Enzyme design. Sequence first.
Site: not given
Ligand SMILES: [Ca+2]
Ligand code: NA
Length: 269
Positions: A2, A32, A40, A62, A73, A75, A77, A153, A163, A165, A215
């Site tokens: 990991q 998304d 993972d 994405h 996770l 772990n 890996i 971006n 965002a 608001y 993002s």
């Molecule tokens: Ca992991």
């Molecule tokens: Na805001």
Amino acid sequence: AQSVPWGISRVQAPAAHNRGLTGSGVKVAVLDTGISTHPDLNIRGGASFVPGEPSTQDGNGHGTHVAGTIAALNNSIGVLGVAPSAELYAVKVLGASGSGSVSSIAQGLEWAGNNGMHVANLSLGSPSPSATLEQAVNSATSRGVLVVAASGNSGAGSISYPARYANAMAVGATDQNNNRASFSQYGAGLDIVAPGVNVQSTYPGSTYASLNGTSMATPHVAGAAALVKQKNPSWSNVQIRNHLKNTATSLGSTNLYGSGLVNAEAATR
Ligand SMILES: [Ca+2]
Ligand code: NA
């Protein structure tokens, strides 16, 4: 083996993990392109609001990447999320190209509220305002959700919707020098920033990939919110949001940075 992506260390998530805080019991919706099954990640549920597509699997990559920054996770890996025990919900509101609509995003926000999500991560934007969108943010907020959204971006000195608001917590991106990334939108409504350059995370096909964007910054904050919620289960969305801001590392002007760099260690002290 990991690997800990630089941004996960930069927001000091491992220190929170060492105090036993992982986001366990916290429901985080990822609005998304979907989330793909991955060694993972654990995906607990979700829903699709993309027409004709009942699957919440990721048709793009994405959303899987965003999800791994929140909750990859812990772990031996892959990578490591800010909140590696958060309960991830795949709320597909963006199609395979990355495009969405006000109506799909709003439907995902309403779903998040009705399904008891604690955090909704919106690594997405619309360039123009929408009352359906603001109302959906407000509806989710009223039901208890902390809505966390990317500033965008374009490099501009105004931020994207939702965002912009008030009831969305707006997140910009920093680089490895802790400067605002050149692309990171800023200005009125910006709340906080987090790592968003060269961010390695989970990707479909049991792969890993490195992306740049607001993002990628947003899920560091969504994950940090989950750590705060696990520590403080009685706290509201607002209380969590303002604690993250009050414990962030100032980077300078609020116009450019909001309260600065999110700090999961300080937020869980
Ligand atoms: Ca992991
Ligand atoms: Na805001």
